Amino acid sequence: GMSDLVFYDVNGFDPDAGYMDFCVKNAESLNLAAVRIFFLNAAKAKAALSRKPERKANPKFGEWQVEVINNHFPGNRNNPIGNNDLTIHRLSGYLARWVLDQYNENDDESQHELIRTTIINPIAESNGVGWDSGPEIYLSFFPGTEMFLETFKFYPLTIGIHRVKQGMMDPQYLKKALRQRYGTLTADKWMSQKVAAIAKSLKDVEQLKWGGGLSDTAKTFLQKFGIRL
């Protein structure tokens, strides 16, 4: 695959092969502005697709246009999804990984500041979690990141485990993450072999500041005392 650079002759959905295909087709036309717009508008895009009868559609986010399968219109819910096809959910996962790749591309502080100020994760932010928590953990609040459990250091799973433990989520919602691979390991194999790694990941999640900042009224008050925020 993409990590060991081993290639094969041309079965089930493999998110690593899906990500490769996505990158071949889209890497050149992606930019941070477009990806920011995507993440701010993913849910709205699903809503919009839900009243469009066409089996495929071509939403545009900023300057970047992309073809997706429309599984949101009720008449289309059954239609098969191809391994190289894009859905809003798959795109969310692929773009979260693309943002991480951008972050890891170099360690200049300007790169990190650009990414931290441009990409917003509304789900993370709604929970009191910002970029300061770490890039993998921040990005793991995005839908679709469960496709890449090793990449995201088990956080797409352990966020869900934490939520269940806190009574914030029905255990059934864990089913998606629990079906995924971890690198080369199948779910049966990592559930058996990676308990320590997952526990370590969960502790990272438990230590997040689940909650937020000072109010506008408080900030205005504090400015009267020469405190600018």
PDB file of C-alpha atoms in Angstrom:
ATOM      1  CA  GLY A   1       0.000   0.000   0.000  1.00  0.00           C
ATOM      2  CA  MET A   2       0.727   3.723   0.404  1.00  0.00           C
ATOM      3  CA  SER A   3       2.879   3.209   3.551  1.00  0.00           C
ATOM      4  CA  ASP A   4       5.171   0.319   2.629  1.00  0.00           C
ATOM      5  CA  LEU A   5       5.125   1.363  -1.106  1.00  0.00           C
ATOM      6  CA  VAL A   6       4.172  -2.105  -2.218  1.00  0.00           C
ATOM      7  CA  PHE A   7       1.982  -2.366  -5.279  1.00  0.00           C
ATOM      8  CA  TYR A   8      -0.208  -5.136  -6.593  1.00  0.00           C
ATOM      9  CA  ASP A   9      -2.123  -6.286  -9.622  1.00  0.00           C
ATOM     10  CA  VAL A  10      -5.733  -5.275  -9.873  1.00  0.00           C
ATOM     11  CA  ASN A  11     -12.903  -6.880  -3.391  1.00  0.00           C
ATOM     12  CA  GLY A  12     -13.872  -5.046  -0.132  1.00  0.00           C
ATOM     13  CA  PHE A  13     -13.363  -1.306   0.473  1.00  0.00           C
ATOM     14  CA  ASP A  14      -9.737  -0.477   1.434  1.00  0.00           C
ATOM     15  CA  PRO A  15      -9.557   3.109   2.730  1.00  0.00           C
ATOM     16  CA  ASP A  16      -5.807   3.275   2.057  1.00  0.00           C
ATOM     17  CA  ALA A  17      -6.370   2.465  -1.637  1.00  0.00           C
ATOM     18  CA  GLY A  18      -9.324   4.907  -1.583  1.00  0.00           C
ATOM     19  CA  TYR A  19      -7.088   7.651  -0.174  1.00  0.00           C
ATOM     20  CA  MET A  20      -4.435   6.925  -2.825  1.00  0.00           C
ATOM     21  CA  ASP A  21      -7.044   7.251  -5.606  1.00  0.00           C
ATOM     22  CA  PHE A  22      -8.378  10.439  -4.068  1.00  0.00           C
ATOM     23  CA  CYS A  23      -4.899  11.956  -3.925  1.00  0.00           C
ATOM     24  CA  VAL A  24      -4.128  10.992  -7.550  1.00  0.00           C
ATOM     25  CA  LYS A  25      -7.290  12.758  -8.697  1.00  0.00           C
ATOM     26  CA  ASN A  26      -7.395  15.747  -6.288  1.00  0.00           C
ATOM     27  CA  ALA A  27      -4.042  16.592  -4.640  1.00  0.00           C
ATOM     28  CA  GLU A  28      -3.226  19.173  -7.312  1.00  0.00           C
ATOM     29  CA  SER A  29      -6.486  21.119  -6.903  1.00  0.00           C
ATOM     30  CA  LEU A  30      -6.836  21.064  -3.075  1.00  0.00           C
ATOM     31  CA  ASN A  31      -5.975  24.033  -0.870  1.00  0.00           C
ATOM     32  CA  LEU A  32      -6.569  24.933   2.735  1.00  0.00           C
ATOM     33  CA  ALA A  33      -9.321  27.449   1.870  1.00  0.00           C
ATOM     34  CA  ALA A  34     -11.371  24.820   0.055  1.00  0.00           C
ATOM     35  CA  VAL A  35     -10.908  22.273   2.823  1.00  0.00           C
ATOM     36  CA  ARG A  36     -11.955  24.820   5.480  1.00  0.00           C
ATOM     37  CA  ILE A  37     -15.140  25.420   3.489  1.00  0.00           C
ATOM     38  CA  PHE A  38     -15.767  21.691   3.186  1.00  0.00           C
ATOM     39  CA  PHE A  39     -15.567  21.056   6.881  1.00  0.00           C
ATOM     40  CA  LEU A  40     -17.828  24.058   7.640  1.00  0.00           C
ATOM     41  CA  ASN A  41     -20.398  22.843   5.101  1.00  0.00           C
ATOM     42  CA  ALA A  42     -20.356  19.004   5.149  1.00  0.00           C
ATOM     43  CA  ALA A  43     -23.669  18.660   6.997  1.00  0.00           C
ATOM     44  CA  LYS A  44     -25.317  21.317   4.807  1.00  0.00           C
ATOM     45  CA  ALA A  45     -24.055  19.481   1.720  1.00  0.00           C
ATOM     46  CA  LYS A  46     -25.742  16.265   2.873  1.00  0.00           C
ATOM     47  CA  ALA A  47     -28.970  18.226   3.477  1.00  0.00           C
ATOM     48  CA  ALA A  48     -28.755  19.735  -0.004  1.00  0.00           C
ATOM     49  CA  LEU A  49     -28.043  16.383  -1.601  1.00  0.00           C
ATOM     50  CA  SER A  50     -31.074  14.888   0.206  1.00  0.00           C
ATOM     51  CA  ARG A  51     -33.476  16.872  -2.041  1.00  0.00           C
ATOM     52  CA  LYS A  52     -31.542  16.207  -5.304  1.00  0.00           C
ATOM     53  CA  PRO A  53     -32.658  13.106  -7.188  1.00  0.00           C
ATOM     54  CA  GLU A  54     -29.453  12.675  -9.264  1.00  0.00           C
ATOM     55  CA  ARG A  55     -27.343   9.616  -8.382  1.00  0.00           C
ATOM     56  CA  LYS A  56     -24.127  11.670  -8.496  1.00  0.00           C
ATOM     57  CA  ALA A  57     -23.465  15.348  -7.908  1.00  0.00           C
ATOM     58  CA  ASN A  58     -20.688  17.882  -8.202  1.00  0.00           C
ATOM     59  CA  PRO A  59     -20.582  20.105  -5.160  1.00  0.00           C
ATOM     60  CA  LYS A  60     -18.070  22.952  -5.082  1.00  0.00           C
ATOM     61  CA  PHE A  61     -16.241  24.022  -1.909  1.00  0.00           C
ATOM     62  CA  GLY A  62     -14.492  27.370  -2.414  1.00  0.00           C
ATOM     63  CA  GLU A  63     -12.729  26.844  -5.759  1.00  0.00           C
ATOM     64  CA  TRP A  64     -12.591  23.044  -5.559  1.00  0.00           C
ATOM     65  CA  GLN A  65     -15.271  20.995  -7.325  1.00  0.00           C
ATOM     66  CA  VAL A  66     -15.630  17.288  -6.746  1.00  0.00           C
ATOM     67  CA  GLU A  67     -17.929  14.499  -7.901  1.00  0.00           C
ATOM     68  CA  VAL A  68     -19.672  12.479  -5.189  1.00  0.00           C
ATOM     69  CA  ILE A  69     -22.179   9.676  -5.000  1.00  0.00           C
ATOM     70  CA  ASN A  70     -25.518  10.966  -3.733  1.00  0.00           C
ATOM     71  CA  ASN A  71     -26.626   8.398  -1.155  1.00  0.00           C
ATOM     72  CA  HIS A  72     -28.622  11.096   0.735  1.00  0.00           C
ATOM     73  CA  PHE A  73     -31.651  11.384  -1.564  1.00  0.00           C
ATOM     74  CA  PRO A  74     -34.054   8.764  -0.148  1.00  0.00           C
ATOM     75  CA  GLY A  75     -34.634   7.173  -3.575  1.00  0.00           C
ATOM     76  CA  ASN A  76     -30.868   6.534  -3.816  1.00  0.00           C
ATOM     77  CA  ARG A  77     -30.144   5.051  -0.382  1.00  0.00           C
ATOM     78  CA  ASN A  78     -29.572   1.506  -1.743  1.00  0.00           C
ATOM     79  CA  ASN A  79     -27.363   2.350  -4.747  1.00  0.00           C
ATOM     80  CA  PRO A  80     -23.985   0.600  -4.500  1.00  0.00           C
ATOM     81  CA  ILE A  81     -20.903   2.642  -3.630  1.00  0.00           C
ATOM     82  CA  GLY A  82     -17.717   1.838  -5.579  1.00  0.00           C
ATOM     83  CA  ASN A  83     -14.343   1.538  -3.840  1.00  0.00           C
ATOM     84  CA  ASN A  84     -12.997   4.634  -5.635  1.00  0.00           C
ATOM     85  CA  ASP A  85     -16.282   6.568  -5.245  1.00  0.00           C
ATOM     86  CA  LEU A  86     -16.517   9.552  -2.922  1.00  0.00           C
ATOM     87  CA  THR A  87     -19.236  10.166  -0.362  1.00  0.00           C
ATOM     88  CA  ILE A  88     -19.391  13.183   1.942  1.00  0.00           C
ATOM     89  CA  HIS A  89     -18.364  10.873   4.814  1.00  0.00           C
ATOM     90  CA  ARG A  90     -15.370   9.381   2.939  1.00  0.00           C
ATOM     91  CA  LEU A  91     -14.296  12.859   1.843  1.00  0.00           C
ATOM     92  CA  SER A  92     -14.372  14.030   5.456  1.00  0.00           C
ATOM     93  CA  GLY A  93     -11.973  11.201   6.361  1.00  0.00           C
ATOM     94  CA  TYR A  94      -9.690  11.726   3.360  1.00  0.00           C
ATOM     95  CA  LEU A  95      -9.522  15.515   3.906  1.00  0.00           C
ATOM     96  CA  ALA A  96      -8.730  15.093   7.627  1.00  0.00           C
ATOM     97  CA  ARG A  97      -5.845  12.889   6.587  1.00  0.00           C
ATOM     98  CA  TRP A  98      -4.804  15.427   3.916  1.00  0.00           C
ATOM     99  CA  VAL A  99      -4.719  18.172   6.565  1.00  0.00           C
ATOM    100  CA  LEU A 100      -2.503  15.964   8.762  1.00  0.00           C
ATOM    101  CA  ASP A 101      -0.212  15.316   5.785  1.00  0.00           C
ATOM    102  CA  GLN A 102      -0.046  19.137   5.287  1.00  0.00           C
ATOM    103  CA  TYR A 103       0.812  19.612   8.946  1.00  0.00           C
ATOM    104  CA  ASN A 104       3.550  16.950   8.844  1.00  0.00           C
ATOM    105  CA  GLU A 105       5.001  18.165   5.505  1.00  0.00           C
ATOM    106  CA  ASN A 106       7.275  20.535   7.416  1.00  0.00           C
ATOM    107  CA  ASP A 107       7.724  21.816  10.899  1.00  0.00           C
ATOM    108  CA  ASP A 108       8.081  25.565  10.198  1.00  0.00           C
ATOM    109  CA  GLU A 109       5.958  27.411  12.769  1.00  0.00           C
ATOM    110  CA  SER A 110       4.335  29.434   9.950  1.00  0.00           C
ATOM    111  CA  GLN A 111       2.958  26.181   8.413  1.00  0.00           C
ATOM    112  CA  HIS A 112       1.415  25.137  11.702  1.00  0.00           C
ATOM    113  CA  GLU A 113      -0.003  28.597  12.372  1.00  0.00           C
ATOM    114  CA  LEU A 114      -1.514  28.680   8.865  1.00  0.00           C
ATOM    115  CA  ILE A 115      -3.198  25.296   9.403  1.00  0.00           C
ATOM    116  CA  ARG A 116      -4.385  25.988  12.970  1.00  0.00           C
ATOM    117  CA  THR A 117      -5.986  29.287  12.006  1.00  0.00           C
ATOM    118  CA  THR A 118      -7.578  28.046   8.720  1.00  0.00           C
ATOM    119  CA  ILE A 119      -8.963  24.601   9.457  1.00  0.00           C
ATOM    120  CA  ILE A 120     -11.802  24.577  11.946  1.00  0.00           C
ATOM    121  CA  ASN A 121     -13.360  21.389  13.343  1.00  0.00           C
ATOM    122  CA  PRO A 122     -16.800  22.478  14.611  1.00  0.00           C
ATOM    123  CA  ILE A 123     -17.375  19.166  16.405  1.00  0.00           C
ATOM    124  CA  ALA A 124     -14.060  19.456  18.328  1.00  0.00           C
ATOM    125  CA  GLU A 125     -14.661  23.123  19.039  1.00  0.00           C
ATOM    126  CA  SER A 126     -18.220  22.462  20.293  1.00  0.00           C
ATOM    127  CA  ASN A 127     -16.601  20.110  22.865  1.00  0.00           C
ATOM    128  CA  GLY A 128     -13.965  22.621  24.024  1.00  0.00           C
ATOM    129  CA  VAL A 129     -11.146  20.967  22.078  1.00  0.00           C
ATOM    130  CA  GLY A 130      -8.775  23.085  19.983  1.00  0.00           C
ATOM    131  CA  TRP A 131      -5.614  22.557  17.911  1.00  0.00           C
ATOM    132  CA  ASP A 132      -3.545  23.040  21.063  1.00  0.00           C
ATOM    133  CA  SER A 133      -4.653  19.508  22.086  1.00  0.00           C
ATOM    134  CA  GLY A 134      -2.475  18.012  19.256  1.00  0.00           C
ATOM    135  CA  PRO A 135      -3.131  17.604  15.494  1.00  0.00           C
ATOM    136  CA  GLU A 136      -4.122  13.902  15.480  1.00  0.00           C
ATOM    137  CA  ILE A 137      -6.506  14.241  18.412  1.00  0.00           C
ATOM    138  CA  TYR A 138      -8.109  17.490  17.083  1.00  0.00           C
ATOM    139  CA  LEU A 139      -8.586  16.043  13.639  1.00  0.00           C
ATOM    140  CA  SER A 140      -9.998  12.770  15.050  1.00  0.00           C
ATOM    141  CA  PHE A 141     -13.277  14.539  15.926  1.00  0.00           C
ATOM    142  CA  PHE A 142     -14.035  14.705  12.181  1.00  0.00           C
ATOM    143  CA  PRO A 143     -16.314  12.060  10.745  1.00  0.00           C
ATOM    144  CA  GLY A 144     -14.502   9.503   8.582  1.00  0.00           C
ATOM    145  CA  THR A 145     -11.248   9.482  10.525  1.00  0.00           C
ATOM    146  CA  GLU A 146     -12.140   6.009  11.818  1.00  0.00           C
ATOM    147  CA  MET A 147     -11.030   4.769   8.408  1.00  0.00           C
ATOM    148  CA  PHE A 148      -7.487   5.489   9.534  1.00  0.00           C
ATOM    149  CA  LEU A 149      -7.131   4.307  13.123  1.00  0.00           C
ATOM    150  CA  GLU A 150      -3.346   3.884  13.029  1.00  0.00           C
ATOM    151  CA  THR A 151      -2.855   7.288  11.377  1.00  0.00           C
ATOM    152  CA  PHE A 152      -4.992   8.926  14.090  1.00  0.00           C
ATOM    153  CA  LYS A 153      -3.450   6.988  16.982  1.00  0.00           C
ATOM    154  CA  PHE A 154      -6.736   5.185  17.858  1.00  0.00           C
ATOM    155  CA  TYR A 155      -8.457   8.549  18.740  1.00  0.00           C
ATOM    156  CA  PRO A 156     -11.424   8.093  16.358  1.00  0.00           C
ATOM    157  CA  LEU A 157     -12.238   4.989  18.449  1.00  0.00           C
ATOM    158  CA  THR A 158     -11.265   6.241  21.922  1.00  0.00           C
ATOM    159  CA  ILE A 159     -13.205   9.499  21.547  1.00  0.00           C
ATOM    160  CA  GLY A 160     -16.227   7.240  21.046  1.00  0.00           C
ATOM    161  CA  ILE A 161     -15.268   5.019  23.999  1.00  0.00           C
ATOM    162  CA  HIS A 162     -14.939   8.076  26.244  1.00  0.00           C
ATOM    163  CA  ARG A 163     -18.361   9.345  25.115  1.00  0.00           C
ATOM    164  CA  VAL A 164     -19.991   5.963  25.865  1.00  0.00           C
ATOM    165  CA  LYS A 165     -18.292   5.817  29.261  1.00  0.00           C
ATOM    166  CA  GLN A 166     -19.691   9.322  29.981  1.00  0.00           C
ATOM    167  CA  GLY A 167     -23.254   8.447  28.902  1.00  0.00           C
ATOM    168  CA  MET A 168     -22.972  10.919  25.999  1.00  0.00           C
ATOM    169  CA  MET A 169     -23.461   8.237  23.330  1.00  0.00           C
ATOM    170  CA  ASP A 170     -25.225   4.970  22.604  1.00  0.00           C
ATOM    171  CA  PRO A 171     -22.671   2.086  22.492  1.00  0.00           C
ATOM    172  CA  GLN A 172     -24.116   1.098  19.085  1.00  0.00           C
ATOM    173  CA  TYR A 173     -22.365   4.081  17.484  1.00  0.00           C
ATOM    174  CA  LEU A 174     -19.019   2.348  18.188  1.00  0.00           C
ATOM    175  CA  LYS A 175     -19.800  -0.287  15.570  1.00  0.00           C
ATOM    176  CA  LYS A 176     -18.258   1.680  12.672  1.00  0.00           C
ATOM    177  CA  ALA A 177     -14.840   2.125  14.349  1.00  0.00           C
ATOM    178  CA  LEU A 178     -14.829  -1.400  15.754  1.00  0.00           C
ATOM    179  CA  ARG A 179     -15.072  -2.840  12.169  1.00  0.00           C
ATOM    180  CA  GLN A 180     -12.009  -1.022  10.877  1.00  0.00           C
ATOM    181  CA  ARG A 181      -8.467  -2.252  10.467  1.00  0.00           C
ATOM    182  CA  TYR A 182      -5.475  -0.973  12.412  1.00  0.00           C
ATOM    183  CA  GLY A 183      -2.668  -0.935   9.863  1.00  0.00           C
ATOM    184  CA  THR A 184      -2.419  -4.562   8.702  1.00  0.00           C
ATOM    185  CA  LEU A 185      -4.461  -5.887  11.662  1.00  0.00           C
ATOM    186  CA  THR A 186      -8.071  -6.877  11.282  1.00  0.00           C
ATOM    187  CA  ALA A 187     -10.478  -5.843  14.037  1.00  0.00           C
ATOM    188  CA  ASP A 188     -10.470  -9.264  15.647  1.00  0.00           C
ATOM    189  CA  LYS A 189      -6.686  -9.093  15.786  1.00  0.00           C
ATOM    190  CA  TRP A 190      -6.303  -5.528  17.169  1.00  0.00           C
ATOM    191  CA  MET A 191      -9.107  -5.944  19.706  1.00  0.00           C
ATOM    192  CA  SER A 192      -7.035  -8.854  21.007  1.00  0.00           C
ATOM    193  CA  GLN A 193      -3.490  -7.446  20.578  1.00  0.00           C
ATOM    194  CA  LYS A 194      -3.760  -3.682  21.082  1.00  0.00           C
ATOM    195  CA  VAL A 195      -5.555  -3.237  24.418  1.00  0.00           C
ATOM    196  CA  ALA A 196      -2.573  -1.350  25.929  1.00  0.00           C
ATOM    197  CA  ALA A 197      -2.271   1.007  22.955  1.00  0.00           C
ATOM    198  CA  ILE A 198      -5.991   1.768  23.049  1.00  0.00           C
ATOM    199  CA  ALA A 199      -5.899   2.372  26.832  1.00  0.00           C
ATOM    200  CA  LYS A 200      -3.007   4.848  26.265  1.00  0.00           C
ATOM    201  CA  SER A 201      -5.051   6.594  23.562  1.00  0.00           C
ATOM    202  CA  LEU A 202      -8.119   6.728  25.844  1.00  0.00           C
ATOM    203  CA  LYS A 203      -6.141   8.360  28.639  1.00  0.00           C
ATOM    204  CA  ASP A 204      -5.126  11.113  26.189  1.00  0.00           C
ATOM    205  CA  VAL A 205      -8.800  11.633  25.398  1.00  0.00           C
ATOM    206  CA  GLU A 206      -9.915  11.620  29.053  1.00  0.00           C
ATOM    207  CA  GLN A 207      -7.385  14.399  29.707  1.00  0.00           C
ATOM    208  CA  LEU A 208      -8.929  16.760  27.119  1.00  0.00           C
ATOM    209  CA  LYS A 209     -10.702  19.824  28.535  1.00  0.00           C
ATOM    210  CA  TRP A 210     -14.217  18.643  27.642  1.00  0.00           C
ATOM    211  CA  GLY A 211     -16.276  21.886  27.960  1.00  0.00           C
ATOM    212  CA  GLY A 212     -14.572  26.954  26.905  1.00  0.00           C
ATOM    213  CA  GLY A 213     -13.223  30.519  26.846  1.00  0.00           C
ATOM    214  CA  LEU A 214     -14.283  33.745  28.543  1.00  0.00           C
ATOM    215  CA  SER A 215     -17.579  35.358  27.530  1.00  0.00           C
ATOM    216  CA  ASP A 216     -17.762  38.455  25.264  1.00  0.00           C
ATOM    217  CA  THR A 217     -19.111  40.460  28.221  1.00  0.00           C
ATOM    218  CA  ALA A 218     -16.100  39.361  30.307  1.00  0.00           C
ATOM    219  CA  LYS A 219     -13.602  40.194  27.541  1.00  0.00           C
ATOM    220  CA  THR A 220     -15.102  43.695  27.129  1.00  0.00           C
ATOM    221  CA  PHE A 221     -14.870  44.185  30.920  1.00  0.00           C
ATOM    222  CA  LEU A 222     -11.262  43.008  31.105  1.00  0.00           C
ATOM    223  CA  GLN A 223     -10.225  45.411  28.328  1.00  0.00           C
ATOM    224  CA  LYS A 224     -11.213  48.266  30.723  1.00  0.00           C
ATOM    225  CA  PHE A 225      -8.282  47.036  32.840  1.00  0.00           C
ATOM    226  CA  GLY A 226      -5.870  46.859  29.919  1.00  0.00           C
ATOM    227  CA  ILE A 227      -6.218  43.104  29.403  1.00  0.00           C
ATOM    228  CA  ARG A 228      -6.579  42.377  25.670  1.00  0.00           C
ATOM    229  CA  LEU A 229      -7.782  38.935  24.546  1.00  0.00           C
TER     230      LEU A 229
END
